[PDB]
Amino acid sequence: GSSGSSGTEERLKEIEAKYDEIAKDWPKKVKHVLHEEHELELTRVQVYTCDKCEEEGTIWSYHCDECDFDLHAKCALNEDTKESGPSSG
Ligand SMILES: [Zn+2]
Ligand SMILES: [Zn+2]
Numbered sequence: 001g002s003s004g005s006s007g008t009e010e011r012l013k014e015i016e017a018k019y020d021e022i023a024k025d026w027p028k029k030v031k032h033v034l035h036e037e038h039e040l041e042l043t044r045v046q047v048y049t050c051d052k053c054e055e056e057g058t059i060w061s062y063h064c065d066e067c068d069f070d071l072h073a074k075c076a077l078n079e080d081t082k083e084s085g086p087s088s089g
Contacts, residue, residue: 019044019059023073030062030076035069040076050075
């Protein structure tokens with residue numbers, strides 16, 4: 001025979017794969033400066049508020065299961081990219 005069925009939420013299988021491709025190089029644990037104490041853990045988040053650059057990330061946010069610190073994928077990756085950079089002298 002042949003019959004049809006309906007669909008439900010919380011079943012994002014393909015979608016997830018997409019994001020992963022974006023964070024293929026992105027590390028699982030980052031060592032931020034403001035939270036140097038511990039290394040955040042890239043946690044999947046729909047929306048949040050970065051406590052570094054004062055922005056809002058999506059489908060990506062460095063969360064810590066110890067202090068609950070959220071950050072941006074890029075913000076965490078980089079160290080000092082606000083005004084100055086790596087220079088010797
Ligand atoms: Zn940020
Ligand atoms: Zn922490």
